[PDB]
Amino acid sequence: SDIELAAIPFNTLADHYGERLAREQLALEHESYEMGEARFRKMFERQLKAGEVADNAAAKPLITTLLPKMIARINDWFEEVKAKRGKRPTAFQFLQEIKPEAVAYITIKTTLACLTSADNTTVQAVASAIGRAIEDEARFGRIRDLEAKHFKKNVEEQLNKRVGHVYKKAFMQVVEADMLSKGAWSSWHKEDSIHVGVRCIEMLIESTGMVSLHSETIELAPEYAEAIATRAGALAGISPMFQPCVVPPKPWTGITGGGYWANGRRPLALVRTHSKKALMRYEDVYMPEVYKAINIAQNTAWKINKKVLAVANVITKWKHCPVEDIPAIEREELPWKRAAAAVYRKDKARKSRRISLEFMLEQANKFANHKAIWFPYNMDWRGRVYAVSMFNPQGNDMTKGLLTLAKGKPIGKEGYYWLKIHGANCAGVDKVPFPERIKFIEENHENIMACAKSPLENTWWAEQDSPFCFLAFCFEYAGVQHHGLSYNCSLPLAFDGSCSGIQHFSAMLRDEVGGRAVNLLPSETVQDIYGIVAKKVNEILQADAINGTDNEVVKLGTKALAGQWLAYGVTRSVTKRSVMTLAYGSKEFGFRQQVLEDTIQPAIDSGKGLMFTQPNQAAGYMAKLIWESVSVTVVAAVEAMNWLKSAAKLLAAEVKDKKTGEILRKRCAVHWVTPDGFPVWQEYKKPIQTRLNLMFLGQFRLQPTINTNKDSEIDAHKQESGIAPNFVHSQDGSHLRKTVVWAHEKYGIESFALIHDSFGTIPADAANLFKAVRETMVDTYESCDVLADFYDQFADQLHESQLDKMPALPAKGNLNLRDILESDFAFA
DNA sequence: GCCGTGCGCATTCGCCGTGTT
């Protein structure tokens, strides 16, 4: 903790926590590096052990160093073969069919995809591959033109959507069948390929230096191999599989080096900037209140919940797990193919959803028994707080259920009450006033005690929404029964804001209309903006049901389209995403994809949607009802969004003198400071090396031709589409930080379970976390005009030169912010 | 400079393992 104690790690740790743990920490931090390095190797090996080195980061810096030098030979060759007054070296014509440097990549990316694939490879081998590779790309690739504007025809849906070595060529080979423009292709036989490759390989040794020698055999040079290899070693040690700490995290006292104690070559950064320049920007920023939050949060002690671990260890192995959606051990034995071949899709998810489950579970068992564990914390560039280790209090239900707070306290009267509210919430009974939630729990007393007594026999808990967190609650609840209000409880009891995006919008705009929808006002009943939008959608569907157009040709009209959804079960869930993203910039076309993928696509997979006859239409239709319904509800917000977008737009713009063509104001990055003093710099940038996508072999970049470069170029588009969510998210993250500091400094709360818009503590402190999250909400927006502050941030610094078509600050509303203090259902 | 025919882009952020049968 001492600014001086930021010396030799082991000494400071032991001095504070004893040599034993001091060792465990460092041993642990070191293991994370080791594990990370392994994970890299395994991959980097399976990469070359399957001819695909060029892809790996390790070879990228080599490729870029040579890829360009090829034209300095390839083309330097053509404009030289043209000097000969006779026949052309055969290769000439059999390489002019595609982009030069595109060949060079297909060349190198293949000369190595063999020099690292097999152990005994010669010129015939390479050439028979290079030339072989020059084709395909020459074939299915020369279709770049005389097909453009029609290639992106999405007739291939994300073209080679399903990745695959030969797959990209499989589900795209007989697809070549279609006559389309012209047609027919005279295969390069099987005697030109070698020749094609031979010159490639020769003008490779002629340009680069890779392929060296003393029929012969090809071998990667000594310095170009020891390079990719060095690059690896010097790359495997930077993606550690960070793990929790067995001692409190190293407090942050600067933009880097907090969290973990071992002082390494690559310490941890406070903000997750992509560029050192971004990070370096915080290098001197005064933000005491921000460091305070991150430190307070990360000093929260957690322990593994031995009982939840107990059931989770076994039950996740059960052939048929009683837990709703837990990835099962094995597959589903062969997918007719028909529409029931989606398995390749569903099992893909399962196997990956399963990987993390076993990792989370292994971490839990690895850390059971420890008196406590901690999670270092840092932030993304908007300032939201994230635990650094893969396993953390912000994970899924099972993860959250495996974790509980280490420092509990006698639960008490209030603690018990909130514990019951939490349990009701974990069960899903949460869109109802508190009295009805308590009743839910009390009138389920025996069920809860049962699941507590014998979880693997009384699995009523697995049936709930947050089964493991609910089970976690049953144990604690059963505990209160066996011991009374004196029971020491440390269960993190979660309070979550209801649609915080809109809440923040309503607060900063004082919008009472919106506020009401998102419980920013005291109310007997619990407002649910998604359910609201859902009702409106139903009035529509109901209306379109009896009288709303019919089918033409084949295209399902309304009425029949509405009936389908009516047949379904349009609920708050279907409208969620869209209501939440609207004010972020999600348009009707967004909704379509959302409804499609979020509720239709999946419903179909399990077979509970055998009444949609083409997800589309069903989706576009739903997307429209939601838009027209969500629009008549979220307005101030949309106004506020558009105001932000205008700001981003005018700052991203590049202003040129109407007459001289001179740049008057260079594109600018949107910048703002959150209420707790966290500065955010939004500056997306259009890629530097305009990459060329060569189907099959993959994609690669290249140093620009035009000497532009300079900074990198701001992405005016991204800058405008992100400003709304980035702004609001930084606003919630600030509220999160302010609440952590407030609850700690005003109520002495030490334990926090923070999940962005979710605030948690032990039952005994629940009541105070409850007022605190509300108090900070009010102090903030009653003390700051974030939009007007934002404006004072760009109005001057970067602007004018004609730019003054800046819409006016949205009109404030009549929402009395202090009412939030008396709102039962606001939570956040 | 001022309105058509075209093209591009769908909200944003975190992070991981696989690249097949």
Add this chain to the structure above:
DNA sequence: TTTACGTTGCGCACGGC
């Protein structure tokens, strides 16, 4: 060396009036 189909609407770009 045997899963994979598919639409719907605002600014930014030329650029001939």
Add this chain to the structure above:
RNA sequence: ACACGGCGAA
């Protein structure tokens, strides 16, 4: 900075 599957999240 482009890919697929996941999850977290607004």
